[PDB]
Amino acid sequence: YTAFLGNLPYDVTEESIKEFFRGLNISAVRLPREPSNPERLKGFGYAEFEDLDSLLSALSLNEESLGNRRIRVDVADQAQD
């Protein structure tokens, strides 16, 4: 499945979601942020997730109000859906 978020207050994606996102492993994480060195905080990410475990957290974990930015998490298709 694919989980994309509204806006990340600092915990965005890529390693962060892979671990913070939830209980299950996510196949991939695409965040407009570059952690290779920059370490940016924006709002808009996508991850391939089992959702299952993620779905539970993704439903609540997400949309949290952080400072002035909330990251929404929703399940978006999977391979071919």
Curated annotation (Swiss-Prot):
PTM info: In response to mTORC1 activation, RPS6KA1-mediated phosphorylation at 'Ser-406' and 'Ser-422' stimulates bicarbonate cotransporter SLC4A7 mRNA translation, increasing SLC4A7 protein abundance and function.
Cysteine pairings via disulfide bonds: none
Positions of the RRM domain: 1-78
Highest taxon above the source species: Eukaryota
Subunit structure: Self-associates and interacts with EIF3 p170 subunit.
Role of this protein: Required for the binding of mRNA to ribosomes. Functions in close association with EIF4-F and EIF4-A. Binds near the 5'-terminal cap of mRNA in presence of EIF-4F and ATP. Promotes the ATPase activity and the ATP-dependent RNA unwinding activity of both EIF4-A and EIF4-F.
The protein's name: Eukaryotic translation initiation factor 4B
Gene: EIF4B
